[PDB]
Amino acid sequence: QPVDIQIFGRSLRVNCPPDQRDALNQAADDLNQRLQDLKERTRVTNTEQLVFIAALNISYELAQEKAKTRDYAASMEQRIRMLQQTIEQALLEQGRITEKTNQNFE
Amino acid sequence: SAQPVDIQIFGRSLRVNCPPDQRDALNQAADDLNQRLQDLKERTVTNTEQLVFIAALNISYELAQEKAKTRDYAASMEQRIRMLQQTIEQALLEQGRITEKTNQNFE
Amino acid sequence: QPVDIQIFGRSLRVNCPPDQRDALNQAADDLNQRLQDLKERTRVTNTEQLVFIAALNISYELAQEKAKTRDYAASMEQRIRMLQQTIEQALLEQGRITEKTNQNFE
Amino acid sequence: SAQPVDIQIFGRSLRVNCPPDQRDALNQAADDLNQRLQDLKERTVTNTEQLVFIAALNISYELAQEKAKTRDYAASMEQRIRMLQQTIEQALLEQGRITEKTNQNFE
Ligand SMILES: [Cl-]
Ligand SMILES: [Cl-]
User: Fold this and answer.
1) CA of D45 to nearest chain A CA: how many angstroms apart?
2) How far is the CA of D53 from the centre of ligand 2 (A)?
3) Parent domain of A6
4) Which residues on chain C are in Cβ contact (under 8 Å) with B29?
5) Strand partners, D5
6) Contacts with C60 from chain A: Cβ below 8 Å
7) In the UniProt record, which is one GO cellular component term (chains B, D)?
8) How far apart are CA A37 and CA D52, in angstroms?
9) Residues with Cβ < 8 Å from A102, sequence gap 6 or more?
10) Which of C9, C3, C42, C43 is nearest to C23 (CA)?
11) Which ligand is nearest to the CA of B34?
């Protein structure tokens, strides 16, 4: 539903269901802080310029974060495979040892 | 390193300082943003500036969600490690308990 | 307490607590069968000869069985160490990945 | 291979057929048995034959107990493997559940 959002001296209108209002307010706070930080460190003063740069940075951040998620999953997958591999080893070793028959002399 | 790169976002030219080893990421980010702004435009009085603000809000939210995914992975894995580590201590306890046994005789 | 045990036509007396009587009867059955088996396969017919050979064989069996126990334990110890090693790997990998900070352009 | 070896057990000479690669085990078994019979003798009318019967009973019992140890190890390990394998399937289930998540947007 329609919501008016304030960011960096600007007034936005965003359509947003109630169960996403809180997410919207956080994103507004996040972006507000991003623009204020970007500014104090890059000497750029124009607001439109700042928002293009911030949008670019944050797209790149999202790309990185998505790579991180893939990397986490790929890594833990490998650990799970090793755990599995340790299990079949335990079973192979158990078979090897227990299947030995005690010898006699005659 | 790090020189200005001329980037075209949605009918706007802007300069971004960027080292060569990030250039490819910069090209991909501009491509991602351009596609995002275009798809947003057809979905929605499109002052380009306000359009970029809305795109940036969406990306902020998506980033927050993406970060929650790894947080959620980590939280699950924390439980898995706990269970594994107890199984390990129980195996150690059991190994000790059985190895301690002494055979008896009759006489 | 005193118990009279019958093995291979011979009459033994063995001092044995009640909570070991059942073990004694099994050992008597085990040995009875060992002597009957040893005989059908080695053509030795003297009983005293048979029992010396059986006692020798079974000492060797016990040595082997004790080695088996040591081998089982040593092997499973190694599996436990690998399980442990997989855990610190999961934690090292987690640290490596999660401690990466998303970069920006400016 | 396998020739007769002259073994002395407790004042008795006997021949045991034994290949070279078991000779060392045979020497150790005769040494073990000799020590066993001697320790049993001081503990106990010592017809040597009856003494060997009693030694053999003790060894049979000790063997049964020793075998029970590995049986007991194996039984414990069976439980440990079960717990590990459930942790593994739960990790797989959890990995799937989290990776399936899709980021939402506002507009
Ligand atoms: Cl968007
Ligand atoms: Cl004994």
Assistant:
1) 30
2) 10
3) 1-44
4) 105
5) D16
6) 102-105
7) cell division site
8) 92
9) C60, C61, C64, C65, C68
10) C3
11) 1
Nearest CA of chain D to the CA of A20: how many Å? 7
Strands (E), chain D: 3-9, 12-18
Which CATH number is D11's domain given?
A: 3.30.160.880
Most C CBs within 10 A among A100, A104, A105, hence the mutation to make, goes to A104
Flag if D60 and C58 touch (Cβ within 8 Å).
yes
Alpha carbon distance B98, D73 (integer Å):
7
Resolution in angstroms for this experimental structure? 2.0
Put simply, the answer to whether B101 touches D54 (Cβ < 8 Å) is: no
Measured CA to CA in angstroms, residue D79 lies from B1, C71, D82, D83 at distances of: 59, 20, 5, 6
Chain A to chain B, count of Cβ pairs less than 8 Å apart? Answer: 101
Provide the H-helix boundaries in chain A: 21-42, 47-98
**Widest pairwise Cα distance in chain A:** 98
Amino acid at D105: N
Check if the beta carbon of residue B60 is closer than 8 Å to that of residue A31. yes
- d(CA D8, nearest CA chain B) in Å: 24
Asked if residues A84 and D92 have their Cβ atoms less than 8 Å apart, the reply is no
Identify all chain A residues contacting B54, using CB atoms and an 8 Å cutoff. Answer: 12, 14
Q: Give the separation between CA D68 and CA D66, rounded to whole angstroms.
A: 5
Q: Which of C73, C69, C55, C7 is nearest to D65 (CA)?
A: C69
Number of C-beta neighbours around residue D32 at 10 A: 18
Residues paired with B3 in a beta bridge: B18
